[PDB]
Ligand binder design. Structure first.
Ligand SMILES: [Mg+2]
Ligand SMILES: [Mg+2]
Ligand SMILES: [Mg+2]
Ligand SMILES: [Mg+2]
Ligand SMILES: [Mg+2]
Ligand SMILES: [Mg+2]
Ligand SMILES: [Mg+2]
Ligand SMILES: [Mg+2]
Ligand SMILES: [Mg+2]
Ligand SMILES: [Mg+2]
Ligand SMILES: [Mg+2]
Ligand SMILES: [Mg+2]
Ligand SMILES: [Mg+2]
Ligand SMILES: [Mg+2]
Ligand SMILES: [Mg+2]
Ligand SMILES: [Mg+2]
Ligand SMILES: [Mg+2]
Ligand SMILES: [Mg+2]
Ligand SMILES: [Mg+2]
Ligand SMILES: [Mg+2]
Ligand SMILES: [Mg+2]
Ligand SMILES: [Mg+2]
Ligand SMILES: [Mg+2]
Ligand SMILES: [Mg+2]
Ligand SMILES: [Mg+2]
Ligand SMILES: [Mg+2]
Ligand SMILES: [Mg+2]
Ligand SMILES: [Mg+2]
Ligand SMILES: [Mg+2]
Ligand SMILES: [Mg+2]
Ligand SMILES: [Mg+2]
Ligand SMILES: [Mg+2]
Ligand SMILES: [Mg+2]
Ligand SMILES: [Mg+2]
Ligand SMILES: [Mg+2]
Ligand SMILES: [Mg+2]
Ligand SMILES: [Mg+2]
Ligand SMILES: [Mg+2]
Ligand SMILES: [Mg+2]
Ligand SMILES: [Mg+2]
Ligand SMILES: [Mg+2]
Ligand SMILES: [Mg+2]
Ligand SMILES: [Mg+2]
Ligand SMILES: [Mg+2]
Ligand SMILES: [Mg+2]
Ligand SMILES: [Mg+2]
Ligand SMILES: [Mg+2]
Ligand SMILES: [Mg+2]
Lengths: 119, 82
RNA sequence: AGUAUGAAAAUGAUUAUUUUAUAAGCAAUCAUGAAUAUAUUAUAUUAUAUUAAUGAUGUACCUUUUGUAUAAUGGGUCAGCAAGUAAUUAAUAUUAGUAAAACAAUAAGUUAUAAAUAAAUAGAAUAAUAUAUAUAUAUAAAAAAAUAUAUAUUU
RNA sequence: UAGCCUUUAUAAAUAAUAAUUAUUAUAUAAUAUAUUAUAUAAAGAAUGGUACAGCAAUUAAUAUAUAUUAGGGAACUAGUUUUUUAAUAAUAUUAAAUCUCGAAAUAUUUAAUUAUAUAUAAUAAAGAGUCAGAUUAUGUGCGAUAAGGUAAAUAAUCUAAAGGGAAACAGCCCAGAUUAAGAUAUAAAGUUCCUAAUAAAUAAUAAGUGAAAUAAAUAUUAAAAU
RNA sequence: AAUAUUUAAAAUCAAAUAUAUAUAUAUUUGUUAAUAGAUAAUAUACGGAUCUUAAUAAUAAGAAUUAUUUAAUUCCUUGGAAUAUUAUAUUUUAAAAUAUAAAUACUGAAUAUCUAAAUAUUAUUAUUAUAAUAAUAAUAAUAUGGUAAUAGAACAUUUAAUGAUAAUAUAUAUUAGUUAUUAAUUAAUAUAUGUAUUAAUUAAAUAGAGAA
RNA sequence: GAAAGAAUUAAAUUAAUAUAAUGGUAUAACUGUGCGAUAAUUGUAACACAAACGAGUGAAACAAGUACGUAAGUAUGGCAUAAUGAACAAAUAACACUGAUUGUAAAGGUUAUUGAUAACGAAUAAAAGUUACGCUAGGGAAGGGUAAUAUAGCGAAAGAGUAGAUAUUGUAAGCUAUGUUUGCCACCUUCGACUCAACAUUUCCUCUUGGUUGUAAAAGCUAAGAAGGGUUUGACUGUUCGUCAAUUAAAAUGUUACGUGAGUUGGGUUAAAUACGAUGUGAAUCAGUAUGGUUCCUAUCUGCUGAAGGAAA
């Protein structure tokens, strides 16, 4: 290994904060998507925008992917997530079966919340 | 109701399927704002690119000209010709 | 190796301005003091020009390579010279001329005007769009595959 | 030659790209134990056999004061018991590139709908170049779970991409330079000084451990929980 | 206290979210540290300086390491409210009371916006003179890194065809201006020439050299 | 209640399939049996799959004829996926198409068939070696990485040690370091001697110290600190190395382009000459042996050794 890819094995505090913020943003996006759908469905039934926003009973999304994203068991929120799953991917060939998320290529775009139950 | 979707991240490190989805959605460059009438189809497409994009719901959409007008900064002066 | 002329450059010496004897690397660019020069509107607290205070950024150029600051190629510098051109043809395209004809006008020819078929004495609505017709295979004649031909004016 | 690139055009043109709907079940309401609507749940039309999971059948491995089949010993007067040797059965437990009876996600992929049209496909007439590739990540073959190794699979970047970060850096993290301007949002990465930018909270460390390239079995000393 | 394990949130408990809801069900989260082991040849090598805080005593420092977090702290549902803080002003006796503010952490690209300029296309205009056009100028949008390659548009140079003009001119050179500038033009200065095969349009090329 | 039939359910594709392996097959594609021996037929084949082209694959339908079946229908070889070869040039037939003045002919064409190019998209009907006498065009189409090996260490301790695993020793298996050996990779196209050495410490000697029923003493053995100083001369060989001789306090191990050829040498390795043994029909060749035998360099910069001038004191 003569070429030096000087990437540290762990993240800095600032990196971790940015990661957390990114995770929070994707959860927010999902929430907005569900909310807009609900609003649209209220309008279809025949309420005003404000009335729809007020509504006690929020409509859950019927499409599959959205419904999965809503579930925390499948796609957890940043507040829900463990410290470890925020900053460590599962890597079967690593010692500890764990690897920094920053070592994943395009980790800033690519999402990866859920690790295996005991790894 | 309308999703105001914004292409927050670039499409440089992004695979070709996700690029194609972004193109279909209508977003060109980074930070290129697009309003979309809400429906299941557009919602699912947005979910598919959830990490590149910032979405927020709105009462009304805006045409490109309106958006431009909103953007324009205040010229702090009033011309008086003589 | 003509004759005039020659502030063309490389190159040498000298003078002037400016910087330089505690500072380290493509010697430039950008920031920015100072010094000097020029300026018949510097009215100035001015403008331009020249100059390695000081600060920041800055790994020659080409070639060949997956990849070159490379200790890979090539160049001492400047001046001059040094590389997709012609002929005879064929196919496309664009325009222009003429146009069911064109070129040529002495005739002759080339292309077009009919599609086929290895080739032969075969060759396009019997009452209309293919469901008709022509050709090649086949045949008594159709059907069948293929391509072509037809819905005031021929293309 | 095809693949990928370019130019000029053609339409009784959206055929392209992306997603949704499509299914199953439950509850409620309305009609005729069925149908429709609404809401919710379910990795949700069709195709599949990798991961995972599993030991079924196949191929392999282990154990039985268990049973049967024979054999070798052994005690009394050929019969009999025990300590057994293998095989077979029974029961329990295990694994495999060429085992999958269970089984994902990603994937392949169809209709209509919506969204992309200052956008795509297809076709027609013409021009190319290229066929030494590299690294990173993931899943493998070879190698020794060695190589800046080698061989291909998928994605990205470099190739041909300047800019910010990673001390310096082809391939990593961001992000694509038409020309400026420099007020505002920022990305990745940073905020004691060098060096543009910082203040806090709660724990732990005392080894300069560490502070952007994490060195192992094991040992000692603590600390919690039982 | 002693012996022996484990270093765990599966179970268990605690806390939080979602469905009927003072409870039940389902989901999500929470379970050690230090040292030794330790190791080669130009020179210490976190990039370097340097970084573990300390009362008296500061209008003042107290990780710049590791782990979990925040953008002053605490409740309620990004937002408001309360709480103290900090700074400031006022009033009263260096303190107290009242009130105003700050709470949007910041840096950061050739990213995006704004601000202007250019070209190209699409869609609207305006002005001036296939007028369903051309030129120029507006507005909105999209696009403009590029090797191999493809396509489009220009300029310099030399010759041929046509061709005014003139030493107050032309050409070449130097210096300083000008025009979004390989080019040309203005002025000054110099040297030549009684003068552009000149401007412009065509036709062509021994038509552009830091790379053999 | 009994007999017979029709059968259904469960299981099975582990047998069998002309043939490998895989998929399929009991609704059988497997097996038996009647007829038959035909469809192991003739012209057009769309449309798909696959696909650079050349080819390859499945195939509806139309037309002619055939075999089986009461009929429905089925058959254009085999349950499927291998069982193969272009043109050119010859050859054989059929076709009635051309017939170089006309007629015949020849010769060519169409249709069907024939043999191989296995380096198997086949260059020709037909082609092996050698060069250290070689030549031209190009390409690189010890250092670096690795650490299997090697060297060193650590953990655990079977076992030796008169008794006791751990004074000293330490099987096989375990965890590391090193980049000193032999390899592997292919980014990257000279051994020894002399001379002068610089550096490391994993210490051979000298200094300090722990352990040593195996430290009585003296010699040792083993371990910790320690790089200040020191660490060989000869015979043999080109040798480093090694064997020995004589010494020494000791004759340590490396790194430095296995330091040092613009500093020396040139014995080894190395081309031209020649011979020998072996190999080859031979030219010639060799992880062979032997004699002979070719590079040079005035120092520009860095650096170092000395010596001046200038200077800001
Ligand atoms: Mg000085
Ligand atoms: Mg110097
Ligand atoms: Mg050099
Ligand atoms: Mg060079
Ligand atoms: Mg040279
Ligand atoms: Mg016929
Ligand atoms: Mg090609
Ligand atoms: Mg469609
Ligand atoms: Mg497999
Ligand atoms: Mg299965
Ligand atoms: Mg290749
Ligand atoms: Mg490689
Ligand atoms: Mg290239
Ligand atoms: Mg770059
Ligand atoms: Mg690119
Ligand atoms: Mg761009
Ligand atoms: Mg340290
Ligand atoms: Mg480090
Ligand atoms: Mg739990
Ligand atoms: Mg060091
Ligand atoms: Mg640092
Ligand atoms: Mg920009
Ligand atoms: Mg371009
Ligand atoms: Mg020329
Ligand atoms: Mg020249
Ligand atoms: Mg040039
Ligand atoms: Mg079988
Ligand atoms: Mg296909
Ligand atoms: Mg084909
Ligand atoms: Mg059969
Ligand atoms: Mg058979
Ligand atoms: Mg031949
Ligand atoms: Mg004749
Ligand atoms: Mg061949
Ligand atoms: Mg071949
Ligand atoms: Mg060949
Ligand atoms: Mg041959
Ligand atoms: Mg010889
Ligand atoms: Mg013993
Ligand atoms: Mg051993
Ligand atoms: Mg090495
Ligand atoms: Mg030592
Ligand atoms: Mg003694
Ligand atoms: Mg001393
Ligand atoms: Mg040497
Ligand atoms: Mg030398
Ligand atoms: Mg040298
Ligand atoms: Mg002699």
């Amino acid at each position: 290994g003569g070429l030096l890819w000087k990437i540290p094995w762990r993240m800095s505090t600032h990196q971790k904060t940015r990661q957390r913020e990114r995770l929070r943003n994707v959860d927010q996006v999902i929430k907005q998507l569900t909310l807009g759908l609900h609003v649209q469905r209220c309008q279809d039934k025949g309420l005003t925008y404000q009335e729809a926003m007020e509504s006690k009973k929020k409509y859950k999304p019927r499409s599959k992917s959205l419904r999965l994203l809503n579930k925390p068991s499948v796609f957890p929120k940043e507040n829900q997530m463990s410290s470890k799953d925020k900053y460590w991917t599962f890597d079967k060939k690593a010692v500890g079966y764990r690897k920094g998320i920053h070592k994943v290529p395009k980790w800033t775009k690519i999402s990866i919340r859920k690790a295996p139950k005991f790894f | 109701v309308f999703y105001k979707v914004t292409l927050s991240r670039s499409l440089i490190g992004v695979p070709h399927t996700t690029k194609s989805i972004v193109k279909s959605l209508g977003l060109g460059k980074r930070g290129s704002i697009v309003y979309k009438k809400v429906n299941p189809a557009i919602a699912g497409s947005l979910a598919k690119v959830k990490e590149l994009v910032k979405v927020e719901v709105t009462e009304h959409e805006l045409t490109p000209s309106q958006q431009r007008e909103l953007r324009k900064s205040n010229p702090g002066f009033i011309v008086e010709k003589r």
